[PDB]
């Protein structure tokens, strides 16, 4: 139908916007601490602690499969990256501090994205 195509254009546009957001967020992680899944070889007990692991590479896979239907779903996954890290790692670690900085600096970007998704209507 014509409607289904219009819908898919919207989703494709959302994906385009979310790809830009993802790049801006990952730029706030120059150490690349959150670039890849936590290694279950190097951290064999990780899944005993963290029940829903997340990372930028995994988000990007979902993104390019157009797997985020709205900004809220995308934000949930971004929040998982941060929250997982702040639980597994102690306050005085480079990992925890990196998550705090990513959350603080990322909020600016996400505040803008929400306004754009609303205004453009995606």
Swiss-Prot record:
There is a cross-link at residue 41 (Glycyl lysine isopeptide (Lys-Gly) (interchain with G-Cter in SUMO2)). Scaffold subunit of various histone acetyltransferase (HAT) complexes, such as the MOZ/MORF and HBO1 complexes, that acts as a regulator of hematopoiesis. Plays a key role in HBO1 complex by directing KAT7/HBO1 specificity towards histone H3 'Lys-14' acetylation (H3K14ac), thereby promoting erythroid differentiation. Component of some HBO1 complex composed of KAT7/HBO1, MEAF6, ING4 and BRD1/BRPF2. Component of the MOZ/MORF complex composed at least of ING5, KAT6A, KAT6B, MEAF6 and one of BRPF1, BRD1/BRPF2 and BRPF3. Interacts (via PHD-type zinc finger domain) with unmodified histone H3. Interacts (via PWWP domain) with dimethylated and trimethylated 'Lys-79' on histone H3. Coiled coil: none annotated. It comes from Homo sapiens. Residues 9-113 form the Bromo domain. Highly expressed in testis. It is found in: Nucleus; Chromosome. This is Bromodomain-containing protein 1. It comes from the Eukaryota.
């Amino acid at each position: 139908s014509m409607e289904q195509v219009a819908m898919e254009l919207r989703l494709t546009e959302l994906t385009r916007l979310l790809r830009s957001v993802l790049d801006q967020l990952q730029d706030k992680d120059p150490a690349r601490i959150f670039a890849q899944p936590v290694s279950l070889k190097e951290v064999p007990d990780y899944l005993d602690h963290i029940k829903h692991p997340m990372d930028f590479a995994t988000m990007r896979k979902r993104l390019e499969a157009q797997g985020y239907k709205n900004l809220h779903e995308f934000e949930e996954d971004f929040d998982l990256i941060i929250d997982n890290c702040m639980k597994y790692n102690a306050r005085d670690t480079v990992f925890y501090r990196a998550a705090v900085r990513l959350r603080d600096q990322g909020g600016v970007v996400l505040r803008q994205a929400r306004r754009e998704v609303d205004s453009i209507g995606l």
